[PDB]
């Protein structure tokens, strides 16, 4: 419980239904702010920081805990039974869709159906499979982020908008420039580090997955390979738009679809 305060725990909305909004890296909750009212009237809406947000106080984040992403999912599962909610829907963006991977396996009942957004079971390449970068790659970008964190800020943020949307490359330059650079760096190496193909098919929630059509992190293959292999009923949107972060930057594209996914479950 003292979680809730530590993860800026915020619900909204009304309603039987509960709809578990969960961030990506370099966001916080307040990514979600425009989607926010499509939902709130029909759902109610669980909002939460991960730990390693700049909206977080750094004092909380453990970087030997938070070595993996079951440290993140046991964050995740202890909101929601100290909010006493014994089922849900959950919409995770990057490594939130990781986390709602890993919590419907540990916790079936309590997911009754997944939205993944920006989504990979894993982001490295390797034999036939196509991740988006290889290990050299990703090891440059971290060398950089080392380097000079604001200059690969800079760098990187409008190519995860990828949509020539400037009001979302400076959206989300203010709150990537919020984390402290050596936990951006850490929460970055353990989402590359992660590889959850092996466990898609225990998976048996039901699942959306939204594809736009060009993701710098996430091949158009991917959407494919999670419908492939998730072990629950998977369905692929596909959102007409360019980028990583359709929350920030197609708000409206990306609302409707949350609005048939959430309809029912």
Not at 3 to 13: K, P, T
Not at 22 to 44: E, K
Request: charge should be neutral; hydrophobic fraction near 45%.
């Amino acid at each position: 419980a003292k979680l809730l305060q530590i993860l800026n725990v915020r619900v909204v909305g009304s309603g039987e239904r509960v709809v578990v909004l969960s961030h990506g890296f370099g966001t916080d909750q307040s990514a979600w702010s425009r989607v926010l009212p499509y939902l709130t009237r029909d759902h109610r809406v669980v909002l939460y920081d991960l730990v390693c947000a700049g909206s977080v106080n750094p004092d909380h984040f453990d970087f030997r805990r938070y070595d993996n992403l079951d440290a993140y999912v046991d964050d995740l599962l202890a909101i929601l039974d100290a909010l006493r909610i014994p089922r849900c829907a959950f919409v995770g963006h990057s490594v939130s869709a990781m986390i709602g991977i890993l919590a419907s396996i540990r916790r079936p009942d309590l997911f009754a159906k997944l939205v993944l957004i920006g989504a990979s079971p894993r982001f490295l390449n390797d034999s036939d499979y196509h991740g988006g970068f290889e290990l050299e790659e990703i090891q440059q970008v971290f060398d950089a982020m080392g380097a000079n964190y604001s200059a690969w800020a800079t760098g990187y943020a409008p190519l995860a908008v990828g949509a020539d949307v400037p009001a979302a490359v400076q959206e989300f330059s203010r709150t990537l420039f919020n984390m402290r650079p050596d936990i951006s760096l850490h929460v970055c190496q353990t989402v590359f580090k992660t590889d959850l193909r092996g466990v898609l098919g225990m998976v048996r929630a039901p699942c959306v997955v939204v594809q736009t059509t060009r993701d710098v992190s996430v091949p158009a293959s991917v959407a494919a390979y999670l419908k492939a292999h998730l072990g629950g009923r998977t369905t692929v949107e596909f959102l007409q738009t360019e980028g990583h972060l359709p929350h920030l930057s197609a708000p409206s594209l990306l609302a409707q679809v949350l609005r048939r996914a959430l309809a029912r479950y």
